[PDB]
Design a protein around this ligand. Structure first.
Ligand code: XIN
Ligand code: CL
Length: 315
């Protein structure tokens, strides 16, 4: 109750919109902007504590069009709150359930965004190591956003044989994306079993069912991504411009950030200094501290307004 006092200053909390084992996420409204945000809540006491320093510091160093944006971090005696970009389209998994499976054309659209995000994550020196439809969300634009960076440093169905054997984090994400590709185009996992060691065994053998509806080029790509030997596996580089990926596009995956923090935004800075009745130069400095506090939150949520073609205005 007193743990939520600091948060409730800045946000109107709505329902729990989801709950994994490690954290609960609530929908909320940022009071100063009216912007919807997802707030991941973690109990420090009943927790795996390294998992959230991993995620927060990863998110501070990752700014990308298909990575879920962090805004505000609040730590209390008993809680850690992470205010994040709200993605109303929900999990990719649920879209794959409602449609039985995606067509090759629709899969490619979706998959190029995943390859974009993961390729960027690798460019910054990280490896996600937990890639699956549950960890990809559709934003308001029906564009994908990658989430849950708790295992990415410098699921077993999606885990690569080397990663389970504990021997190469970049090649393991390629494997996981192979499983993801398969799920998108088939509607089920290529390796699956109710017994965890039997699933393990299937993964090591590398043999899977190849449904009739798949094209020969899809099957080739799956065969290249799901090599048990990571040396034989296709690298991230040649994934970006693979003939299958290029189909209907004819350019490689644009993996670079289209929203890199170059300088600041003057329209956001002015509205803050105007709304708070502060010296403009002083407002430029406190934003530039980048503490991921309520001020950082307000600035970043005003960029979000600009990014969606809306006026940068507080109330
Ligand atoms: C690093 O990033 C993260 O760690 C992270 C993790 C999760 C989310 C996130 C960031 N950002 C989000 O938005 C997240 C979720 N968002 C969501 C969106 C839509 C739904 N769905 C499908 C609803 O139907 C909810 N819907 C109900 C009706 N009311 C009126 C509106 C809200 C459910 C969850 C979500 C959270 C928990 C688990 C799964 C996903
Ligand atoms: Cl692209």
């Amino acid at each position: 109750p007193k743990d939520y006092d600091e948060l409730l200053k800045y946000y109107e909390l709505h329902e729990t919109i989801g709950t994994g084992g490690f954290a609960k996420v609530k929908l909320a409204c940022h009071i100063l902007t009216g912007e919807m945000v997802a707030i991941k809540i973690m109990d420090k006491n009943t927790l795996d504590l390294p998992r959230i320093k991993t995620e927060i510091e990863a998110l501070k160093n990752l700014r990308h069009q298909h990575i879920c944006q962090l805004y505000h971090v609040l730590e209390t005696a008993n809680k850690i709150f992470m205010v994040l970009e709200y993605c109303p389209g929900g999990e990719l998994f649920d879209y794959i359930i409602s449609q039985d499976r995606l067509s090759e054309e629709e899969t490619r659209v979706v998959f190029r965004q995943i390859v974009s995000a993961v390729a960027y994550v690798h460019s910054q020196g990280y490896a996600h190591r937990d890639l699956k439809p549950e960890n990809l969300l559709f934003d308001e634009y029906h564009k994908l956003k990658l989430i849950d960076f708790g295992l990415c440093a410098k699921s077993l169905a999606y885990a690569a044989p080397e990663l389970i054997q504990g021997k190469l984090g970049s090649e393991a994400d390629v494997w996981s994306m192979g499983i993801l590709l398969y799920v998108l185009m088939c509607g089920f996992l290529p390796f699956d079993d109710d017994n965890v060691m039997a699933l393990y065994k299937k993964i090591m053998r590398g043999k899977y069912d190849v449904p009739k509806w798949l094209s020969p080029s899809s099957i080739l790509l799956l065969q290249q991504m799901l090599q048990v030997d990571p040396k034989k596996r296709i690298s991230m580089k040649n994934l970006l411009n693979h003939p299958w990926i290029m189909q209907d596009y004819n350019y490689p995956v644009e993996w670079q950030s289209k929203n890199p923090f170059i300088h600041l935004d003057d329209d956001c800075v002015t509205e803050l200094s105007v709304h708070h009745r502060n010296n403009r130069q002083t407002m430029e400095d406190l934003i530039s501290l980048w503490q991921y506090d309520h001020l950082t939150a307000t600035y970043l949520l005003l960029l979000a307004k600009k990014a969606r073609g809306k006026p940068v205005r507080l109330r």
